[PDB]
């Protein structure tokens, strides 16, 4: 098994203004067909609040790719700030942990 790269990004500036925050994660050509990307926000896993469709393998190189759609409420995301996504499967839990803060760093006292 070989866990590909993982990239996560917050919803559009105006997107959140709509009254709901939606996180998106880009998955790279994975090995195992059971490649599922996990959601993580401010050290909080997002289970149930995510639903995306499967993408067909390319043709130029018969490659593979998948994307996840996270659906969160405006207030829900307001409490969070960090966004990270990692791929999971029979192989390893996660190859590389990629996260980023939207409001402030996670090295301060309680708020």
Curated annotation (Swiss-Prot):
GO CC list: extracellular region; immunoglobulin complex; plasma membrane
Keywords: Adaptive immunity, Cell membrane, Disulfide bond, Immunity, Immunoglobulin, Immunoglobulin domain, Membrane, Repeat, Secreted
Start and end residues of each stretch annotated as Constant (C) domain: 1-104
Organism superkingdom: Eukaryota
Domain Ig-like, first and last residues per copy: 4-101
Coiled coil stretches, renumbered: none
DNA-binding in keyword set: no
Keyword Membrane carried by entry: yes
Subcellular location(s) of the protein: Secreted; Cell membrane
GO biological process per UniProt: adaptive immune response
Main location: secreted
Disulfide bonds: 25-85
Assembly mode: Immunoglobulins are composed of two identical heavy chains and two identical light chains; disulfide-linked.
Function description: Immunoglobulins, also known as antibodies, are membrane-bound or secreted glycoproteins produced by B lymphocytes. In the recognition phase of humoral immunity, the membrane-bound immunoglobulins serve as receptors which, upon binding of a specific antigen, trigger the clonal expansion and differentiation of B lymphocytes into immunoglobulins-secreting plasma cells. Secreted immunoglobulins mediate the effector phase of humoral immunity, which results in the elimination of bound antigens.
Protein name: Immunoglobulin kappa light chain
Source organism of the structure: Homo sapiens (Human)
């Amino acid at each position: 098994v070989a866990a590909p790269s993982v990239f996560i990004f917050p919803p559009s500036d105006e997107q959140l203004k709509s009254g709901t925050a939606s996180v998106v994660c880009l998955l790279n050509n994975f090995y195992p067909r059971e490649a599922k990307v996990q959601w993580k926000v401010d050290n909080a896993l997002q289970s149930g609040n995510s639903q995306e469709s499967v993408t067909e393998q390319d043709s130029k190189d018969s490659t593979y790719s998948l994307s996840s759609t996270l659906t969160l409420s405006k207030a829900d995301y307001e409490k969070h700030k960090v966004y990270a996504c990692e791929v999971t499967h029979q192989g390893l839990s996660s190859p590389v942990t990629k996260s980023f803060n939207r409001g402030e760093s996670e090295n301060l006292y309680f708020q």
